[PDB]
């Protein structure tokens, strides 16, 4: 729903020569806030990330993040990123985001992206 | 079970003004780092980490990730982290690392720290 | 011959990049201009002995923000036997931002004694 | 008067600052560099009108490899009217790792003019 394509940077690795893990946080991150400002967005506050690592990347490396929500409970919602070496699936993301200090009904233009 | 005490740079701030949640993981994996360092510590593998983020942190502040495990399924195990800024708690992480391409008995200098 | 742009490198700024007071670090510069010349290596083919920088220096002339979208373009001075500058320029949109100078030995790694500089890198006088 | 060391901070590498070929990466340098200012302007109580980097530059003499715990001794000089420069020595145990340097100049923030620098910094002559 969100595609995100970019280069591994050589300083992204880590001494054992592969991406850092914390990087990938940094990846999912941008995938976000892209997302977000194409979509111009009381605002939302990530309570909650994860990342399972599948497969380790190495310099150098194009990949792509598939970005898609998939549950709205009003005033909450959960947002999955897939990060793919060509069409190898290198690792899943995925983070909890509240609006807001208290709860305010989900934005009307995410309760649209279904 | 193990401590570490360190304090905020400036540039771990992202424009908002305070800590990008992604440094959240640069401080857990260094405590994780650290206290296999201690340990002497085939190998283990993150496979999976997250994050819960309760209070956002400014600069200057002083920190401390008391970490401990929290179960050893053989060749598996869970590690927490938790993120004092003084008394009062920041943030929780939690690692899933595994022991290896196949699946070896957990080192026993870990099925030790009970 | 050396002076010239060799390579050009466009990308776009992190939201992470900025430090803050709302520009991006300038450690993050560094960053760039490391993968400018990473990729130009590249391109030359050039990856036991190798580059290794022995300094390298920044002049920030505006400051950059989020969103953005940069251009570094590099050129090659001062070949020495071992050694070479780089300098880099970096461009938002036509207006230049910073410059950066990066000067670069050839080295044994294993050994650490200092090694004539490649062919190819000679052969742009 | 200025030139002598006036800050010193000491700290430990994380295991994240290397760099792929095995020590720590160069950017971070300034990250340390910029650490070691900050505190030290805190120290003089400073922090609407106030100092940005000009330039910054750094000499890579030995490189720094995990674990380790280094040593940075700070030291001004050249103050003008609104400029100064800060040299940077950062020592691993006694062995000088690298020298930085960086200039900085007093600004207003708001409307980025060129302001005559603090008195506490010029009492230091």
Known sequence: IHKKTFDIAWGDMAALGHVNNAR???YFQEARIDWLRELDITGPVVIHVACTFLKP????ATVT?????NSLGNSSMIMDHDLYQEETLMAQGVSKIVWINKSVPLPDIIRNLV
């Open 65 to 69: 993040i598939h970005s898609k929500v």
């Open 24 to 26: 990938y946080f940094d």
């Open 57 to 60: 990347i190495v310099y150098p």
